[PDB]
Amino acid sequence: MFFINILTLLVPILIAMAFLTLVERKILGYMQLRKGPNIVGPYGILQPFADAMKLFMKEPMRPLTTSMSLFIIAPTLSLTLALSLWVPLPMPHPLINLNLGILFILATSSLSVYSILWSGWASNSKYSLFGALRAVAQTISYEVTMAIILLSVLLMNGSYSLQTLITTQEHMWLLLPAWPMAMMWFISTLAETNRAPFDLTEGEYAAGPFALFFMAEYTNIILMNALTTIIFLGPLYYINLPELYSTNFMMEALLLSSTFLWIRASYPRFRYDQLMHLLWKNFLPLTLALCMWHISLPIFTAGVPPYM
């Protein structure tokens, strides 16, 4: 039964990424006063399969000055992490019920720098290494707030578990409080996923590797929006209606993933220096201040949460 559960978890998220590609294209088109894909299949639902076939049918021109080891284990690692992140997620009951689950998320997210850096060091150049260093620095820098935000918001629920946030928001979202922490969390998800306006790394791989990188990217997108939904937009949980919880979670995650593309179409890009100034001069001060605020709140209020 467990292998069946694993299949039910993995297959749909991959399908959902493959179709999130199409949703992005169509939304950007309609925002640009055009349609997008209409032909290959009814409304385009065959275009992702077409593209997958095309890529995987191309011929890989593997750079000659390179290392096959780091050439193969970079996208393998990326996809492995992007899939193993979806495991602990309570939807509402999790495939693997972990304590310290958000910490597992932090770590398995921070482990992608290794691939995004080995790819560059493998490609024998200096421009690719420059780009890789810069992207690594960006991702690293934003991991700091990605961590502190949770460190401060996990004091309204005294546990690092994801199955406690359901009862923590059994009456009210964690957005009304910490809406300044969300606005800083919703963005570090863009910069972490190198998503516009933070795409200074994609604005040098064969068909298969490029496809794996694409899959990892969009999977991480869906997952970050799912974390937002679970944490700051706690859906409904009636003990007998996991169906209800899952429906609401899906709706909110789709809202968020469409907001990402809304933004991509709406705004220009950033400049690496200004992108780093943003964090190190606007997000870290406010983050530390609100961290102290949220360490004091449960004290000068008698609302310090429990450890079950």
Ligand X SMILES: CCCCCCCCCCCCCCCCCC(=O)OC[C@H](COP(=O)(O)OCCN)OC(=O)CCCCCCCCCCCCCCCCC
Residues 84-143 that bind ligand X (CB under 6 A): 84, 98-100, 104, 108
70 binds other proteins (CB under 8 A): no
Alpha-helical (H) ranges within 32-126 are: 47-57, 68-84, 101-110, 113-122
The verdict on 296 binding ligand X (CB under 6 A) reads no
| Residue 183 interacts with ligand X (CB under 6 A): yes or no | yes
Min CB(72)–ligand PC1 separation in Å: 20
| Site for other proteins contains 43 (CB under 8 A) | yes
CA 209 to CA 83: how far, in whole Å? 16
From residue 86, alpha-carbon distances to 21, 105, 138, 286 in Å are 19, 9, 24, 30
Paired tokens of 26? 């169509």
Of 278, 284, 291, 297, which lies in the binding site for ligand X, with binding defined by CB under 6 A?
278
Residue 172 touching other proteins (CB under 8 A): no
- Binding test (CB under 6 A) with ligand X, winner from 28, 250, 263, 297: 263
**Quick one: which of 135, 184, 216, 222 contacts ligand X (CB under 6 A)?**
184
The interface mask with ligand PC1, positions 17-46, x = CB under 6 A, is: ----------------------x-x----x
CB of 114 to other proteins, least distance (A): 14
Report how many residues bind ligand PC1 under the rule CB under 6 A. 6
Q: Does an H or E element contain 210, and which?
A: helix 207-232
CA angle 302, 303, 307 (to 5 degrees): 120
Tokens encoding 127 = 């421009």
The answer, yes or no, to whether the previous bond of 48 is cis (omega within 30 of 0) is no
Q: Confirm or reject binding of residue 159 to other proteins (CB under 8 A).
A: yes
| Nearest one of 305, 157, 128 to 231, comparing CA atoms | 157
Q: With respect to other proteins, which residue has the nearer C-beta, 173 or 257? A: 257
**Closest residue to ligand PC1, Cβ-based?**
49
Closest by CA position to 275, among listed 190, 183, 150, 149: 190
